[PDB]
């Protein structure tokens, strides 16, 4: 092979006492090592399995640890070799955390790329537009299941987006804006997509046998106690509400400043809405500053398990997304357009608004940022050791933003899904090229779900049936506030019924890899079972005596 | 023993050909039989285990069938003997359905009472007022777990009812009717009781090892195909909406007739509201006629499994309970009192209403029906074979009615919980005396939950936060309809948040029999695990060569 059978490579930063304990702990478990020179201040330890008699023991111990928790190619061997380095010494072997405690001089451990499979996949998918189900299994036998779930989800979202893009173009030549047919169909689409993906997840976790790995909770190495009381965390978790209430006011001031400068320009053609465009093209910069504060606040709260840090980070990213993406449109649909006679004499300092202003705001906030934003072995190992590290959490955030724009403010302008579909099609195979050229290879982490991002998509539908049903009343064709509060009531309690009726009609249809596992488990059980198989009573002793 | 080691007794109604196949199928599996004369047209077949070598085989086969589905005293032996008679011939033995197909001449099979334990329990509990946790385990080692769950639930409900009874008496000497403090506290009590019982169920199913028996689905013998298409059932399931819409109109006509006769009596002291009292004391009679129609409609829909017939019957009983119990008070709180100037000149035929009429309606509907409604072996076997059969589904229906009155209409009159607590205390040990004197003994059926009745109690809280927050606005101190529809919105969406905050604070507190099973499973796993445990690479062959 082009790699020299190297399973992993460990980078050790620099004295010669922390190196011998590393080599001893790697040689205690069965691993063969080889030491070479790093870049300029480090050493490289290449690690593979020592013999064929120890790889079988490692595979058997990992299967025992899987079977004891209810869970029971290249990406299986790399997984059972990675569990021989980092799993603690009582359970598995050598317990090497990367750099937190007693291992501060280890920088990172990482596997090596295989350029032949990456070249023979990026060529055969350069013009295909839709990956087959035998193509998703090659983004699983390399990179594991945590990457395959993400790629399958993005392809299913692109396949479902073609219906609002083709229905909102026909609801723009024939019906216009603020329609009831488009609002009802768009609200049903958001229910059907989520309830369809929730069973595609069970299908895909029955196909790739990772059915119950969500309950095996890992433990963070950056936890600092060991026990930490659950009330000292519930007081550090209250620094989120002044952060949210301060960010909301700091954005409302900027949006009111744009509303004042547009009035001052309009008093003294298309250059009137320049202070809105220059704010709408600058939100991905001012939303990447609040995420660093959210990350510092999430690291301050001192979580113990790894599957709680991710839920806290997702919940903190959702609030920043809401504040910086949907508050500039909520503040001009419910506060500024229906109250434009008690606000405009206040915002017109140095004294000198139809519902089309809302349509122009939706156009400028879902288009502008997209238009603006468009020997030989030891050398390549040193090149691969200097690349960045990949994550899927920066590409599902943009998907959640797009889904919120579809669920909330789509009746205002029905060419929002066409504008999202064109942008999704231009950069289709761009995150694959990112993951096998300009990043380093991730260890084959297993997964069961795309994560807690599926719980933020169900919130944004419930809000949408309120918001998109208070616009169709307010701006189609005197507001008459009781009819608005009756429309909101009946729309929300009809959403809650249609979601129940859709959720229980998709539970009867079984996908083809759940039926195969059900038949196999039934056959195993019914094959195991058939291999297994005082003077009152002395009156009728025998069978034929009782019948006589 | 006083019983002659009789495990079961089978009643066979009458020619002599259907008897020999019964005795042969009972003797194929290992069971000793003895035949005696029945009452006047039947025979009695007494059945016990044949030897000590076959009871062990039956216990082992029942444990194998439990372990293959994830589940793994007197009430264990009776359970494994009952599974040797009715379980189909491919899995267990002899497949005797009581009377549906090929066994039409078998009337019933039933075990015998033990009068010594029933006498020594009904005496030691005749003055105790609260059963200990070593007393619920004697209503489990006899009668099984399906009866013990019911008795534990009723005792927990009686223990929680003492707080609204003591708080609504203090909100009647000091604050009166239609209060905000009483409405908020009463709405929080209904959340805390349900979320507390939902973890007491997990505690009790970890104590009595029946943790996962809800997934083992049984099969109805009255199913008539074998397959039945799932769309011929979904058209028979649409005969429920004309039944409901006809029962509602047939009750609204009667309530309007009472409203007319009260006006006609009042025109021409306490005898004015006689046509309401005589309707409020007659609802348990006219609600036992609609349940027979609901039972016929539920048997017409042809369900296959036993755990779907029960959910359909509970859902059909809930609608009849709603229509006949809360519609006479909804029709006089939202239709008749605020519109008493456009209705009273219509209901006053032969021409000749404060908010205290609503208080009198709640008084007459939660009090009146309660005040108005207050040798030697072969002889006792023939006496026990003529008693009725017991069920727990006629005593949880009255509990669900009482909980709906507490959740919905309690701010109108705060002596509703005192009136329920007095009635619950007068007849405390009355369903135990019913189950061991005037019924026959049930076979020890296992259980995991009280059933789908816990899903009707969560609906009645969600409705209550609407209803009990539209009365406090409407009748305390011009209705001003936008303020009513704003009160309903904020009350419902505050209920949905407080229920989430209570549900996730009770998940951290673990009851003492869940921790013991967690520690035991952890110790078993950590006891099983510790018993288990090319010129590039030939440069540094060995451990100490790499460190040098
Ligand atoms: C326009 C044609 C677009 C064809 C694009 C294909 C498409 O619509 O997506 C399919 C499902 O979408 C969908 O059913 C979207 C769900 C439909 C929800 C709306 C139903 C209202 C029907 C009223 C419509 C007429 C007005 C996915 O197919 P899959 O293989 O993944 O299964
Ligand atoms: O009144 C005029 C007409 O009102 C109207 O058309 C009445 C329009 C109100 C209709 C409400 C739109 C229904 C949206 C349902 C979406 C959720 C459904 C979820 C189901 C999946 C407009 O009002 P305005 O103040 O200008 O005078
Ligand atoms: C009056 C004293 C009545 C004493 C009766 C005992 C009692 O209240 O029931 C306990 C729980 O009830 C309860 O907490 C009911 C839940 C309380 C929900 C209301 C909280 C508001 C507190 C504001 C109250 C003051 C105003 C059950 O005890 P357990 O052993 O089953 O646990
Ligand atoms: O106006 C008057 C005063 O209104 C008032 O007191 C205003 C009273 C409205 C207050 C609403 C009651 C709150 C009920 C919360 C329960 C759910 C909470 C769930 C939390 C667990 C009465 O109105 P009326 O027409 O006679 O003139």
PDB file of C-alpha atoms in Angstrom, chain A residues 4-7 19-20 23-25 27 32-36 46-48 60-61 64-65 67-69 89-92 230 377-378 462 466 481-483 485-486 488-489 492-493 496 508 522 524-526 528-529 532-543 546-547, chain B residues 4-7 19-21 23-25 27 32-36 46-48 60-61 64-65 67-69 89-92 230 377-378 462 466 481-483 485-486 488-489 492-493 496 508 522 524-526 528-529 532-540 542-543 546-547:
ATOM      1  CA  UNK A   4       3.359   1.914   5.001  1.00  0.00           C
ATOM      2  CA  UNK A   5       0.688   0.013   6.987  1.00  0.00           C
ATOM      3  CA  UNK A   6       0.569   3.003   9.357  1.00  0.00           C
ATOM      4  CA  UNK A   7      -2.603   2.934  11.422  1.00  0.00           C
ATOM      5  CA  UNK A  19       8.726  10.118  26.231  1.00  0.00           C
ATOM      6  CA  UNK A  20       9.715   6.777  27.766  1.00  0.00           C
ATOM      7  CA  UNK A  23       6.513   4.480  24.558  1.00  0.00           C
ATOM      8  CA  UNK A  24       6.042   2.095  27.502  1.00  0.00           C
ATOM      9  CA  UNK A  25       2.283   2.671  27.662  1.00  0.00           C
ATOM     10  CA  UNK A  27       4.110  -1.054  24.133  1.00  0.00           C
ATOM     11  CA  UNK A  32       4.475  -1.563  17.222  1.00  0.00           C
ATOM     12  CA  UNK A  33       6.020   1.922  17.164  1.00  0.00           C
ATOM     13  CA  UNK A  34       8.577   3.788  15.063  1.00  0.00           C
ATOM     14  CA  UNK A  35       9.993   7.238  15.865  1.00  0.00           C
ATOM     15  CA  UNK A  36      10.929   9.869  13.265  1.00  0.00           C
ATOM     16  CA  UNK A  46       4.035   5.848  13.934  1.00  0.00           C
ATOM     17  CA  UNK A  47       1.800   3.161  15.442  1.00  0.00           C
ATOM     18  CA  UNK A  48       0.427  -0.084  14.002  1.00  0.00           C
ATOM     19  CA  UNK A  60     -12.730  -9.272  20.814  1.00  0.00           C
ATOM     20  CA  UNK A  61     -12.412  -6.849  23.743  1.00  0.00           C
ATOM     21  CA  UNK A  64     -17.291  -7.401  24.507  1.00  0.00           C
ATOM     22  CA  UNK A  65     -17.485  -3.738  25.542  1.00  0.00           C
ATOM     23  CA  UNK A  67     -22.189  -6.237  23.810  1.00  0.00           C
ATOM     24  CA  UNK A  68     -22.168  -5.197  27.471  1.00  0.00           C
ATOM     25  CA  UNK A  69     -24.053  -1.967  26.604  1.00  0.00           C
ATOM     26  CA  UNK A  89      -6.420   1.709  31.670  1.00  0.00           C
ATOM     27  CA  UNK A  90      -8.950  -0.209  33.771  1.00  0.00           C
ATOM     28  CA  UNK A  91     -11.198  -0.967  30.773  1.00  0.00           C
ATOM     29  CA  UNK A  92      -9.045  -0.934  27.638  1.00  0.00           C
ATOM     30  CA  UNK A 230     -25.372  20.325  40.391  1.00  0.00           C
ATOM     31  CA  UNK A 377       6.438   9.593   2.507  1.00  0.00           C
ATOM     32  CA  UNK A 378       7.939  11.700   5.302  1.00  0.00           C
ATOM     33  CA  UNK A 462     -44.102  25.349  15.688  1.00  0.00           C
ATOM     34  CA  UNK A 466     -47.849  31.214  14.425  1.00  0.00           C
ATOM     35  CA  UNK A 481     -57.006  42.426  17.139  1.00  0.00           C
ATOM     36  CA  UNK A 482     -59.483  39.735  18.255  1.00  0.00           C
ATOM     37  CA  UNK A 483     -59.469  38.221  14.758  1.00  0.00           C
ATOM     38  CA  UNK A 485     -55.646  36.346  18.176  1.00  0.00           C
ATOM     39  CA  UNK A 486     -58.304  33.924  16.904  1.00  0.00           C
ATOM     40  CA  UNK A 488     -53.202  32.417  15.820  1.00  0.00           C
ATOM     41  CA  UNK A 489     -55.162  30.071  18.127  1.00  0.00           C
ATOM     42  CA  UNK A 492     -51.437  26.585  16.156  1.00  0.00           C
ATOM     43  CA  UNK A 493     -53.951  24.014  17.338  1.00  0.00           C
ATOM     44  CA  UNK A 496     -50.549  20.296  16.582  1.00  0.00           C
ATOM     45  CA  UNK A 508     -46.901   1.927   9.837  1.00  0.00           C
ATOM     46  CA  UNK A 522     -37.441 -13.369  14.733  1.00  0.00           C
ATOM     47  CA  UNK A 524     -32.965 -16.420  15.571  1.00  0.00           C
ATOM     48  CA  UNK A 525     -35.495 -16.459  18.427  1.00  0.00           C
ATOM     49  CA  UNK A 526     -37.707 -19.108  16.812  1.00  0.00           C
ATOM     50  CA  UNK A 528     -33.412 -20.992  19.661  1.00  0.00           C
ATOM     51  CA  UNK A 529     -36.824 -21.825  21.130  1.00  0.00           C
ATOM     52  CA  UNK A 532     -35.262 -26.138  23.965  1.00  0.00           C
ATOM     53  CA  UNK A 533     -38.506 -28.089  23.703  1.00  0.00           C
ATOM     54  CA  UNK A 534     -53.848 -36.523  48.870  1.00  0.00           C
ATOM     55  CA  UNK A 535     -56.697 -39.014  48.636  1.00  0.00           C
ATOM     56  CA  UNK A 536     -58.492 -36.549  46.354  1.00  0.00           C
ATOM     57  CA  UNK A 537     -56.031 -37.189  43.520  1.00  0.00           C
ATOM     58  CA  UNK A 538     -55.690 -40.978  43.875  1.00  0.00           C
ATOM     59  CA  UNK A 539     -59.260 -41.640  42.720  1.00  0.00           C
ATOM     60  CA  UNK A 540     -58.678 -41.500  38.938  1.00  0.00           C
ATOM     61  CA  UNK A 541     -55.001 -42.366  38.441  1.00  0.00           C
ATOM     62  CA  UNK A 542     -54.339 -42.145  34.709  1.00  0.00           C
ATOM     63  CA  UNK A 543     -55.555 -40.370  31.608  1.00  0.00           C
ATOM     64  CA  UNK A 546     -60.912 -39.532  33.890  1.00  0.00           C
ATOM     65  CA  UNK A 547     -62.677 -39.721  30.521  1.00  0.00           C
TER      66      UNK A 547
ATOM     67  CA  UNK B   4     -56.316 -29.662  47.941  1.00  0.00           C
ATOM     68  CA  UNK B   5     -53.208 -28.482  46.030  1.00  0.00           C
ATOM     69  CA  UNK B   6     -55.556 -27.407  43.220  1.00  0.00           C
ATOM     70  CA  UNK B   7     -53.818 -24.976  40.897  1.00  0.00           C
ATOM     71  CA  UNK B  19     -64.020 -34.039  26.303  1.00  0.00           C
ATOM     72  CA  UNK B  20     -61.400 -36.653  25.412  1.00  0.00           C
ATOM     73  CA  UNK B  21     -59.463 -34.170  23.265  1.00  0.00           C
ATOM     74  CA  UNK B  23     -58.189 -34.366  28.620  1.00  0.00           C
ATOM     75  CA  UNK B  24     -55.593 -35.491  26.055  1.00  0.00           C
ATOM     76  CA  UNK B  25     -54.328 -31.953  25.445  1.00  0.00           C
ATOM     77  CA  UNK B  27     -52.242 -34.679  29.675  1.00  0.00           C
ATOM     78  CA  UNK B  32     -52.620 -34.137  36.583  1.00  0.00           C
ATOM     79  CA  UNK B  33     -56.412 -33.917  36.241  1.00  0.00           C
ATOM     80  CA  UNK B  34     -59.446 -34.993  38.259  1.00  0.00           C
ATOM     81  CA  UNK B  35     -63.064 -34.811  37.065  1.00  0.00           C
ATOM     82  CA  UNK B  36     -66.061 -34.039  39.296  1.00  0.00           C
ATOM     83  CA  UNK B  46     -59.242 -29.896  38.608  1.00  0.00           C
ATOM     84  CA  UNK B  47     -55.692 -29.378  37.333  1.00  0.00           C
ATOM     85  CA  UNK B  48     -52.336 -29.405  39.126  1.00  0.00           C
ATOM     86  CA  UNK B  60     -37.466 -23.051  32.612  1.00  0.00           C
ATOM     87  CA  UNK B  61     -39.466 -22.703  29.382  1.00  0.00           C
ATOM     88  CA  UNK B  64     -36.630 -18.784  28.248  1.00  0.00           C
ATOM     89  CA  UNK B  65     -39.661 -17.128  26.636  1.00  0.00           C
ATOM     90  CA  UNK B  67     -35.431 -13.844  28.280  1.00  0.00           C
ATOM     91  CA  UNK B  68     -36.007 -13.972  24.519  1.00  0.00           C
ATOM     92  CA  UNK B  69     -38.049 -10.725  24.685  1.00  0.00           C
ATOM     93  CA  UNK B  89     -49.036 -25.370  20.820  1.00  0.00           C
ATOM     94  CA  UNK B  90     -45.969 -24.340  18.815  1.00  0.00           C
ATOM     95  CA  UNK B  91     -44.536 -22.232  21.665  1.00  0.00           C
ATOM     96  CA  UNK B  92     -45.869 -23.615  24.947  1.00  0.00           C
ATOM     97  CA  UNK B 230     -55.721  -1.711   7.502  1.00  0.00           C
ATOM     98  CA  UNK B 377     -64.742 -28.517  49.483  1.00  0.00           C
ATOM     99  CA  UNK B 378     -67.029 -29.330  46.547  1.00  0.00           C
ATOM    100  CA  UNK B 462     -53.731  20.913  29.194  1.00  0.00           C
ATOM    101  CA  UNK B 466     -57.256  27.045  29.153  1.00  0.00           C
ATOM    102  CA  UNK B 481     -62.577  39.712  23.844  1.00  0.00           C
ATOM    103  CA  UNK B 482     -58.948  40.501  22.931  1.00  0.00           C
ATOM    104  CA  UNK B 483     -57.956  40.360  26.609  1.00  0.00           C
ATOM    105  CA  UNK B 485     -57.769  35.616  23.910  1.00  0.00           C
ATOM    106  CA  UNK B 486     -54.519  37.063  25.285  1.00  0.00           C
ATOM    107  CA  UNK B 488     -55.681  32.072  27.078  1.00  0.00           C
ATOM    108  CA  UNK B 489     -52.485  32.374  24.991  1.00  0.00           C
ATOM    109  CA  UNK B 492     -51.347  27.842  27.834  1.00  0.00           C
ATOM    110  CA  UNK B 493     -47.801  28.709  26.834  1.00  0.00           C
ATOM    111  CA  UNK B 496     -46.192  24.164  28.488  1.00  0.00           C
ATOM    112  CA  UNK B 508     -32.389  13.757  38.356  1.00  0.00           C
ATOM    113  CA  UNK B 522     -22.898  -2.215  36.856  1.00  0.00           C
ATOM    114  CA  UNK B 524     -22.227  -7.654  36.943  1.00  0.00           C
ATOM    115  CA  UNK B 525     -20.739  -5.899  33.898  1.00  0.00           C
ATOM    116  CA  UNK B 526     -17.530  -4.892  35.689  1.00  0.00           C
ATOM    117  CA  UNK B 528     -17.611  -9.965  33.598  1.00  0.00           C
ATOM    118  CA  UNK B 529     -15.145  -7.574  31.957  1.00  0.00           C
ATOM    119  CA  UNK B 532     -11.816 -11.335  29.998  1.00  0.00           C
ATOM    120  CA  UNK B 533      -8.609  -9.320  30.251  1.00  0.00           C
ATOM    121  CA  UNK B 534       8.360  -3.605   5.366  1.00  0.00           C
ATOM    122  CA  UNK B 535      11.857  -2.184   5.713  1.00  0.00           C
ATOM    123  CA  UNK B 536      10.313   0.862   7.397  1.00  0.00           C
ATOM    124  CA  UNK B 537       9.457  -1.141  10.520  1.00  0.00           C
ATOM    125  CA  UNK B 538      12.663  -3.202  10.798  1.00  0.00           C
ATOM    126  CA  UNK B 539      14.803  -0.180  11.693  1.00  0.00           C
ATOM    127  CA  UNK B 540      14.049  -0.031  15.445  1.00  0.00           C
ATOM    128  CA  UNK B 542      12.188  -3.467  20.120  1.00  0.00           C
ATOM    129  CA  UNK B 543      10.901  -1.110  22.773  1.00  0.00           C
ATOM    130  CA  UNK B 546      12.884   3.616  19.883  1.00  0.00           C
ATOM    131  CA  UNK B 547      13.554   5.613  23.055  1.00  0.00           C
TER     132      UNK B 547
END
